[PDB]
Paper text:
State 1 was then used as a reference to build structures of the remaining two states. The central stalk is rotated by almost exactly 120o between each of the three conformational states suggesting common stable low-energy intermediate states in bacterial ATP synthases. Structural alignments of the γ-subunit between states revealed that the three states differ by almost exactly 120°. In F1, we observe the canonical “Walker-Boyer” state geometries in both the “open” conformation (βE, “empty”) and the “loose” conformation (βTP, with bound Mg–adenosine 5′-diphosphate). As in Bacillus PS3 (10), the third β-subunit (“tight” or βDP) is in a “forced open” conformation (denoted as βDP*), and we find only weak map features in this region, which we interpret as a loosely bound inorganic phosphate ion. The A. baumannii ε-subunit is similar to those seen in other bacteria, containing an extended C-terminal α helix. While the E. coli subunit ε bends here and protrudes “horizontally” between the αDP- and βTP-subunits, A. baumannii ε continues further upward into the F1 head, forming two more helical turns followed by a five-residue extension, which forms several additional interactions with the γ-, βTP-, and αDP-subunits. This may further stabilize subunit ε in the inhibitory “up” position, which blocks rotation in the hydrolysis direction, while still enabling ATP synthesis. The A. baumannii a-subunit contains an additional loop extension between aH4 and aH5. As the a-subunit loop insertion is conserved within the Acinetobacter family but is absent or structurally diverse in other bacteria and the mitochondrial ATP synthase, the unique a/c10 interface in A. baumannii represents a prime target for the development of highly specific inhibitors.
Residue numbers in the entry:
A (entry chain p): 2 to 52
B (entry chain L), F (entry chain O), G (entry chain K), I (entry chain J), L (entry chain R), N (entry chain S): 1 to 80
C (entry chain a): 15 to 291
D (entry chain e): 2 to 70
E (entry chain g): 194 to 241
H (entry chain P), J (entry chain Q), K (entry chain H), M (entry chain G): 2 to 80
O (entry chain b): 3 to 52
The structure:
């Protein structure tokens, strides 16, 4: 009974993490990576600039 | 039987009430556009004024039917 | 089942496990002004928030940000930008309190995603080893802080701050004097109805209702969501629980929205209390 | 009936005469014009103009931007 | 340019502006200035 | 049976009441745009009146049906 | 008979209430477009005001009738 | 007894709400239709066909309720 | 007798309530267009404000009458 | 006994409110739809497909209510 | 006994309908107000003046109803 | 008990009914403006469609919630 | 006993009607606000201040209904 | 007792129903205008979306607060 | 639900603590991005110097 109900809820979090990857992870990861890229470029430009 | 009298009174009152409420909204909705149009084209005022009575006479048909039955209940009511 | 389900709906909405001084843990019937065992678990969630921010705070470096500190930089810059571009005039730790309340309510709301019964039923283990089984089965465990007392205490502090900046006008009389929705009603019996009652109703409604509105709006969100989750738990055999996944997706959507609205309206109200003259 | 239509460019007049109908593409969308129309003015998309004579013959004039009155 | 016209003889009708009047006025003014320049060039050609 | 008579009377009343309420607003909403359009294109008045008659006849069908049921209740009703 | 008096009071209240509700909304809907028209054509105020009086008198007829029946019930009602 | 009156009330509600909905819906459709056909008189038949398409799509549910009301009138359950 | 008192109370409440609901809608509907009219042509502000007052004084008549009947039921009610 | 009449009237309300909602909603949608297609006739198929999409999105809850009403009608609880 | 409950209902109606009216009224008034002030940003002061005037003119009947409701709440007749 | 069963059935019916009525109007109000917008900027169909889904998801939450309590009442009801 | 249920009904009405009013008023205001801001984006803060003045003036009476309802729920007269 | 439970159920149903009815129309009214605004100024999507969410959060307060007391009555009710 | 003033008391108290007590490590954090902008403006001025 009780555990059998929790079996369905096991399916739940499985599908939640499945949809979390495909939908939520790429945008956040891309935002992080891109902001890191603009920061790195801005500092590297300053480096060659000081040279 | 007194209960029947009260219920018939309520029904009759509803008959006039809803008709009046509907007609009041309808006439305002029509008149707003009518005034705006006559502002747009003051030249054609008689023609628009004719059309507006045409549709107004076409409008209140059903409510006037209900008011008749409402007055019918007040004086010569069935169920007695 | 049916008796068991009714007992369960007796169980999960038990207020803060209702501890009591000069008494035992609880009997589900005390219902007096006594101890509460939920916001302690909420503070157990706030402490990780402070520790996580302290991790970056102690590490003061201008180098290339790693992913975690990059994300925290996003958050701080976003809240700073909102506070700045929207609101201005004067600054006394306003953005800090805003960023604290935002993340704190967000993390509190976030905990709802866990199943209804996994934590309490795993807590049957600690029930078995200590304090017995039946005391756990009357009222022992609590869910994330969705109870109205949390949000009420939350909002009333903001109300106190509204008072504190609303006396910045250097005089209670100057602040109390305000424009009314009912400056005039010439008719004499109308004036009788107007003078005392309507104006008293005005001074009641002008400010007092707003924090109540905030607290109750957040409470409705939390309580409705959790009750939906408990109600879904029936008829498990032949189903994929399609009644749960999209609904919890919408719940994920509404969590951040509610946190954002709370934070934004709080700063709005502080700005209004900071209005010149 | 018929109404006076004049299509004039910045250099000279292109088309003129009496026409019964006009089709043009205004900023909002297509427009049908008949005599007695309420006063109106738009900006024309770069598309052809269609005018219907009383006899049934239909002349078409190409216009690239302009003002319709 | 003779703006005194159509004040005594103006009627009580306005157009039905498909775009907002501001954009229409801007579009009219640009083309009017361009036409003034063109017909000022043509007269110079005749003078030449 | 008295309460049954009263409830039947109430039902009969509300039948035509809602119909009148609907028709009054509907005709007004239609006629407003009708007058505005005929002002915009004064040449199409007969064609616009043809279309308006078509749609008006298509509109009031259900309220007229309800009026029939109401009258049926009034004169020759079931539940006796 | 007590319930009869109470229901008569209720019905009479409904009669006046719905009429007032309709008239209040209708007059506002009319006056809005009326103000737009008078602003756009300030030279045209009197004849538009005349039109507005015409349609306003045409508007509140049925609600005024309902007020009459309400007063009828209030002062001397049937069913006694 | 009282059940019969309640059935009568339910039947009245079914028809009345449907009529009220249809009356408003058709008027709202017709206002825009007339305005559109006034703007572009040439395209009258195609717009007219689009009308009947959308109107047949519209009047369904009230028509469904009408049948239920008539069923309660003639051959009702609960007796 | 208690039922009569309660029903009179309900009727009185309806009388004021519906009138208030109507007036609140109508005043706002008028005011929106009033604001547009005054903003578009600010020169005409006093004339437009006078016309709006005329419309308003013509508007609230029936709800104002209804409030009187409601208060009449409140203090000196019939049917007792 | 009194239960049955209440069941009937509840079932009537279920269908009635859904019909009232759908009738007004479809009219509101079709008004703009017809107004749009007249403005840009070349876009008729795409706009019509979008209209089907949103119409299917619209009538969901009323159709849900209709089934509950019918279940009350034929084989209901409370017996 | 029933008198108390019915008086409670009446008092509730008095407050409820007035609140429903005022909420709609101020909402649709303020929408138009914001639309207007956007057109003429310089003309804000007298716009607010007129808007406050008409707003004060608006709440009269709802305030009358609220007072009667509270009168019923505290010291009602019929007792 | 019988009366309680009837009343809870009524409550259940109300729960679904009002939600359906609300969502039907809401979706129509949104979709009309959506169809108007897409015609004005035909290139922006995908992003506008995504925004429309966002609004639709945000909209029907509360009615969908009420459907849950309605189903609860129909199947597993309290007060028994 | 009946008085308790009637007070419950009255309380439900008190919150519900004011809620229905606010839910429409705020939408009507916000729509015009969104149109206004999109047309003059650089004027956003002034419009927001006007809007919140409007909201504060608006939400008053429904709060009044909510307060009386809450008073009824916990500490009611008529007992 | 039984009647008290039935009335509690009815009141709880109204609490949910009216809130759903309000929100489902409010969100539609907001979203339509949002779509018009984003269509006219496609580059201002993010700030417009932020303004939206501010509005939406400020909007749904009173009804969906009433939802909470509705659920309260459903499960943990006074008057018993 | 139930008032249970203990809950709101602890909520306000621990809120005021967990906020004021740790406003400061945040106040540290505002500076890093700002000085990064300083760096990225000065490296912009260097080319004018060239």
């Amino acid at each position: 009974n009780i555990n059998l109900t929790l079996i369905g809820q096991a399916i739940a979090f499985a599908f939640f993490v499945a949809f979390c990857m495909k939908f939520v992870w790429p945008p956040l990861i891309n935002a992080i990576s891109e902001r890191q890229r603009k920061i790195a470029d801005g500092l590297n430009a300053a480096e060659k600039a000081k040279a | 039987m007194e209960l029947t009298l009260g219920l018939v009174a309520i029904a009759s009152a509803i008959l006039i009430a809803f008709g009046a409420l509907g007609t009041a909204i309808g006439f305002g909705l029509l008149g707003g556009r009518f005034l705006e149009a006559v502002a747009r084209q003051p030249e054609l005022a008689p023609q628009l004024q004719t059309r507006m009575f045409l549709i107004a006479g076409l409008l209140d048909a059903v409510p006037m039917i209900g008011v008749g039955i409402g007055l019918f209940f007040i004086f010569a009511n069935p169920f007695v | 089942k049916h008796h068991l389900t009714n007992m369960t709906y007796g169980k999960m909405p038990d207020g803060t496990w209702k501890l009591a001084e000069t008494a035992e843990e609880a009997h589900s019937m005390g219902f007096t002004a006594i101890h509460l065992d939920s916001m302690g678990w909420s503070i157990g969630l706030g402490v990780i928030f402070c520790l996580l921010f302290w991790i970056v705070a102690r590490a003061a470096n201008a180098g290339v940000p790693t992913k975690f500190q990059s994300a925290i930089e996003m958050i701080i810059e976003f809240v700073d930008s909102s506070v700045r571009d929207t609101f201005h005039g004067k600054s006394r730790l306003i953005a800090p309190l805003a960023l604290t309340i935002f993340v704190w309510i967000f993390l509190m709301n976030l905990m709802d995603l866990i199943p209804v019964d996994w934590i309490p039923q795993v807590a049957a283990f600690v029930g078995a080893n200590v304090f017995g089984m039946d005391p756990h089965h009357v009222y022992f465990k609590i869910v994330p802080s969705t109870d109205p007392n949390i949000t009420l205490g939350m909002s009333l502090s903001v109300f106190v701050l509204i008072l504190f900046y609303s006396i910045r006008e250097k005089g209670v009389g100057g602040f109390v004097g305000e424009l009314a929705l009912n400056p005039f009603n010439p008719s004499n019996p109308v004036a009788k109805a107007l003078l005392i009652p309507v104006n008293l109703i005005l001074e009641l409604v002008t400010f007092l209702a707003r924090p109540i509105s905030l607290a109750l709006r957040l409470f409705g969100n939390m309580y409705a969501g959790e009750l939906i989750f408990i109600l879904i738990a029936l008829l498990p055999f032949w189903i994929q629980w399609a009644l749960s996944v999209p609904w919890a997706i919408f719940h994920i959507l509404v969590i951040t929205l509610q946190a954002f609205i709370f934070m934004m309206l709080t700063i709005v109200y502080l700005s209004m209390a900071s209005e010149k003259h | 009936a018929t109404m006076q239509c004049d299509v004039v460019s910045v250099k000279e007049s292109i088309y003129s005469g009496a026409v019964t109908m006009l089709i043009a593409k205004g900023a909002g969308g297509e427009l049908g014009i008949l005599p007695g129309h309420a006063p109106l003015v738009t900006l024309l998309q770069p598309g052809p103009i269609r005018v219907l004579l009383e006899n049934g013959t239909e002349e078409i004039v190409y216009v690239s931007g302009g003002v319709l009155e | 340019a003779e703006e005194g016209d159509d004040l005594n003889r103006t009627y009580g009708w306005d157009y039905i502006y498909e775009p907002e009047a501001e954009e229409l006025l801007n579009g009219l003014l640009v083309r009017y200035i361009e036409s003034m320049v063109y017909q000022g060039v043509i007269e110079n050609v005749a003078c030449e």
